[PDB]
Design a protein around this ligand. Structure first.
Ligand SMILES: *[C@@H]1O[C@H](CO)[C@@H](O[C@@H]2O[C@H](CO)[C@@H](O[C@@H]3O[C@H](CO[C@H]4O[C@H](CO)[C@@H](O)[C@H](O[C@H]5O[C@H](CO)[C@@H](O)[C@H](O)[C@@H]5O[C@H]5O[C@H](CO)[C@@H](O)[C@H](O)[C@@H]5O)[C@@H]4O)[C@@H](O)[C@H](O[C@H]4O[C@H](CO)[C@@H](O)[C@H](O)[C@@H]4O[C@H]4O[C@H](CO)[C@@H](O)[C@H](O)[C@@H]4O)[C@@H]3O)[C@H](O)[C@H]2NC(C)=O)[C@H](O)[C@H]1NC(C)=O
Ligand SMILES: Cc1nnn(Cc2cc(C(F)(F)F)ccc2CCC(=O)N2CCN(S(=O)(=O)c3ccc(S(N)(=O)=O)cc3)CC2)n1
Ligand SMILES: [Ca+2]
Ligand SMILES: [Cl-]
Ligand SMILES: [K+]
Ligand SMILES: [Zn+2]
Length: 805
């Protein structure tokens, strides 16, 4: 109950919301049908429109008017945005030459520059170029401030997941808004776009920017706007709040536009009808900047122009129907559209098997426009698994397509020509970022970055300490003139051992044989020095990674590679090696095909054995430093050490072998050498974080050799590809991946063909940031470079996406 008999006289858009049954006058009241009787009259005035005209100039203050052209208006702080233009001969902000803002030029009493976030739904990255003739205000911001070519959203590329990721710096899996539709099985509740359950605070995890601000003594303007409140009134309210007394005035504000997303759904991303929504957004931006300039705040305030996601061409004829794959289509529930989530309709039905459902959706048509997944097999870059609200079965839908349950759902519910929600690496889903103001840089292009990073930056812009989040704080320091956060390297927790020769061949009973019984003081002293670390400068280019958890490990040196060997997991955590442009691939000789050799620096009890692999019919084994790239027949023996061995399913070996035999050399040619660091990953609980020993669900049969869920590689070279990887004076270039370690290749529908037609394609899909790999291994890479740490942080968040321009 709301007793709406109270009034909004003097309370219009109040910043502290009052509790029922008292009526409300805040900018959300409309959405809860709880405004006071007079809210429309007093707070949503529209009389005489939104602009001063010559004849209104100097008028008598009429309080009924939407905005005022009277003489007193400036001091009341309620002029129309164009008042000084029309009535005082000033220019519009867009017509002024832009001039560097080296320091905040703010009115007295302002304790910090305010931050205004102008968020636009569906603003696809390519509109900045393609709509440039009709968006002059936005184009001034972009060219005079700091901008990226695009900003990467989070998956799913839907509105609520992305706006709340912008607000918190969290992946949807961690903040809880994992879609626009959701079911929580612990609550036994459903979250929808329509209706009231979305207003319950239990859905919304983490700490959004406005609560972070409030808690640390920074006043926040309320971020949300009810849909019926027109844009012009949202702007005027923000400008009103900026006129307030120093002790009541907020330091951070948000504007939200439902365009261009709303139109984009009807007319498609580039429909001729889309020009007009872009004109109107630009007009609104123009009103803000004109308003700020009136208040002498235009060289004081930091303005962020940011989108949540883009828009793709999607029509009703491009729908895949689960009814054309599943006989049992009525026993499931489908969250449909640009992604698919499948659970059982009834939890009482114990004859619901997700495996047979997955199998019925796998490679069944030759052009199939979706791929099903257990959520824990989704690419790790999506971070879309560790939440009870995300269904075990997921469908990644091809760009331009939909998935529905049955045809009746598509015609009983063609209307739309645009949609979004696809994989966040897809170009059409990319969105925008511009930063403009004293704390941002002048006329600066920055590289593409992910929207998870902005929460930290907005905290920095407001002098706030950010709540724990998934940004990498410091990775966007290059956007800022000052206010930068100065990060330190995390301290190494476990120092390594450096074992020498401590064991005789005969102490090992591994069941491993090798054809290596063949016999010199020139090449004996020389090989010792390789085992003590003479070529380590060659193979470990960026320092050894730091282990950031408590564990027991050994650094092992060799001619061609260097490893940090875990005595706990009985395999390397990492293997580092460099392949120059001119290095040569060789084969595995016939005498060494099944050769595995004891490592005399590591005890039998901390080594693997071959009998485990013999007795495990499912599990085979592979190598982290590839024998294929040994530098000499003598060096090749080092690659067959038991300490270079890792468990591999025969299906994964096809992948690994192709990567090691062909691709590594291919990349070395194309990039002028590469440093490679490869290793195992264990994420049985799919939280994106290194598992402890006691979380490992699978061992090689009859042993304590744990089985990785994934294998990673980090491939680094010189950004200036004229210089070789091993002699690079400048910025680095990196690409990486996290391959799921799977016993079949069902993910790759063309896997029965030659590895040259699908392997590289699989790797692309499972491309990763170094930072992803850090979370999963508890390692810290690039500890010793000649580069700044911020630059390295930027490099660690880089994702190689494999999309075109
Ligand atoms: C992205 O960044 C985020 C943010 O930094 C990272 O997530 C953090 O990971 C931490 C490590 O896993 C995690 O720390 C745990 O916190 C537990 C207390 O959590 C509450 O308090 C925080 C702080 O205010 C709050 O934010 C939490 O909110 C979560 O949960 C509610 C649901 O109840 C949601 O509303 C909210 O959206 C959020 O959900 C997300 O996180 C939870 C996990 O916290 C997931 O389950 C969800 O799926 C969702 O992703 C909470 O209200 C604390 O209890 C944990 O401690 C246990 O484990 C330690 C290990 O050291 C052990 O020693 C302790 O004994 C303890 O175990 C006890 O409970 C066990 C299970 O019941 C039991 O086995 C034991 O026997 C014990 O009884 C732990 O310290 C932190 O909460 C989250 N934070 C967030 C916001 O998600 C994330 O890792 C980053 N991602 C990547 C890839 O880097
Ligand atoms: C979603 C979402 N998550 N965070 N935001 C705030 C946000 C964040 C940014 C930023 F991160 F800075 F970029 C910019 C602009 C906005 C405003 C977005 C907006 O005005 N709308 C329209 C209104 N609704 S609503 O569904 O009616 C609704 C009402 C109340 C609640 S509650 N329970 O939190 O009180 C929840 C939903 C959400 C979308 N929206
Ligand atoms: Ca884990
Ligand atoms: Cl959804
Ligand atoms: K085997
Ligand atoms: Zn939309």
């Amino acid at each position: 109950w709301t007793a709406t008999s109270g009034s909004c006289k003097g309370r219009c858009f109040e910043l502290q919301e009052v509790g029922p049954p008292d009526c409300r006058c805040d900018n959300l009241c409309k959405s809860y049908s709880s405004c006071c009787h007079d809210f429309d009259e007093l707070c949503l005035k529209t009389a005489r429109g939104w602009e001063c005209t010559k004849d209104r100039c100097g008028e008598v203050r009429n309080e009924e008017n939407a905005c005022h052209c009277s003489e007193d208006c400036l001091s009341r702080g309620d002029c129309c945005t164009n008042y000084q233009v029309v009535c005082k001969g000033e220019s519009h902000w867009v017509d002024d030459d832009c001039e560097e803002i080296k320091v905040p030029e703010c009115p007295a009493g302002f304790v910090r520059p305010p931050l205004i976030i102008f968020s636009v739904d569906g603003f696809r990255a390519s509109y900045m170029k393609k709509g440039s003739k009709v968006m002059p205000n936005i184009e001034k911001l972009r060219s005079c401030g700091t901008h990226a070519p695009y900003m990467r959203p989070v998956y799913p590329t839907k509105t609520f997941p992305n706006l709340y990721t912008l607000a918190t710096g969290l992946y949807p899996e961690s903040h809880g808004i994992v879609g626009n539709s959701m079911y929580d099985p612990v609550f036994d509740a459903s979250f929808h776009l329509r209706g009231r359950e979305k207003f319950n605070h239990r859905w919304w995890g983490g700490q959004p920017l406005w609560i972070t601000a409030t808690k640390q003594g920074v006043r926040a303007g309320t971020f949300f706007w009810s849909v019926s409140i027109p844009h012009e009134r949202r702007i005027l309210t923000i400008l009103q709040w900026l006129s307030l007394p120093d002790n009541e005035r907020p330091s951070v504000y948000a504007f939200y536009s439902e365009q261009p997303d709303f139109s984009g759904h009807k007319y498609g991303p580039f429909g001729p009808e889309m020009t007009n929504p872009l004109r109107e957004i630009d007009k609104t931006v123009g009103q803000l900047m004109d308003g700020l300039k009136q208040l002498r705040l235009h060289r004081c305030v930091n303005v962020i122009f940011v989108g949540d996601h883009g828009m793709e061409d999607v029509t009703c004829d491009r729908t895949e129907f689960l009814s054309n794959y599943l006989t049992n289509v009525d026993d499931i529930t489908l969250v449909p559209g640009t992604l698919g989530r499948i659970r059982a309709k009834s939890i009482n039905n114990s004859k619901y098997d997700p495996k047979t459902i997955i199998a019925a959706l796998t490679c069944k048509k030759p052009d199939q426009h979706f791929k099903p997944y257990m959520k824990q097999h989704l690419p790790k870059r999506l971070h879309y698994a560790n939440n009870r609200r995300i269904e075990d079965i997921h469908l990644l839908v091809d760009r331009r397509w939909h998935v529905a349950r049955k045809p009746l759902d598509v015609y009983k519910k063609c209307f739309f020509q645009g949609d979004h929600g696809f994989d966040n690496k897809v170009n059409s889903m990319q969105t925008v970022f511009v930063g403009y103001g004293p704390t941002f840089k002048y006329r600066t292009k920055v590289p593409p970055f992910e929207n998870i990073e902005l929460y930290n930056v907005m905290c920095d812009l407001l002098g706030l300490k950010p709540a724990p989040n998934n940004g990498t704080h410091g990775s966007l320091n290059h956007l800022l003139r000052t206010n930068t956060f100065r990060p330190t390297m995390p301290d190494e927790v476990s120092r390594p051992n450096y074992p020498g020769i401590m064991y005789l061949q005969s102490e090992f009973d591994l069941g491993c044989t090798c054809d290596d019984k063949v016999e010199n003081k020139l090449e004996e002293l020389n090989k010792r020095l390789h085992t003590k670390g003479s070529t380590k400068e060659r193979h470990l280019l960026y320092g050894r990674p730091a282990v950031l958890y408590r564990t027991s490990y050994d650094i092992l040196y060799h001619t061609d590679f260097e490893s940090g060997y875990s005595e706990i997991f009985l395999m390397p955590l990492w293997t580092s090696y460099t392949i120059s442009k001119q290095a040569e691939v060789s084969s595995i000789p016939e005498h060494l095909t099944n050769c595995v050799r004891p490592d005399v620096r590591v005890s039998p009890g901390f080594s693997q054995n071959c009998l485990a692999y013999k007795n495990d019919k499912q599990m085979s084994y592979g190598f982290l430093f590839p024998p294929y790239l040994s530098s000499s027949p003598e060096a090749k023996y080092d690659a067959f050490l038991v300490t270079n061995m890792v468990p591999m399913y025969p299906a994964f070996k096809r992948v690994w072998a192709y990567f090691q035999r062909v691709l590594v050399k291919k990349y070395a040619s194309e990039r002028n050498g590469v440093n490679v660091i490869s290793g195992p990953i264990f994420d049985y609980n799919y939280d994106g974080l290194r598992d402890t020993e006691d979380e490992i669900k699978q061992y090689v049969e009859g042993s304590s050799i744990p089985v990785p869920t994934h294998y990673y590689s980090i491939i680094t070279s010189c950004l200036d590809f004229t210089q070789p990887a091993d002699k690079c004076d400048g910025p680095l270039s990196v690409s990486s991946f996290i391959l799921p370690h799977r016993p079949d290749n069902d993910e790759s529908c063309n896997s029965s063909e030659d590895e040259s037609k699908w392997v590289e394609e699989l790797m692309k899909m499972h491309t990763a940031r170094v930072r992803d790999i850090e979370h999963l291994t508890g390692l810290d890479f690039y500890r010793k470079t000649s580069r700044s740490y911020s630059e390295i942080l930027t490099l660690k968040t880089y994702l190689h996406t494999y999309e075109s321009e």
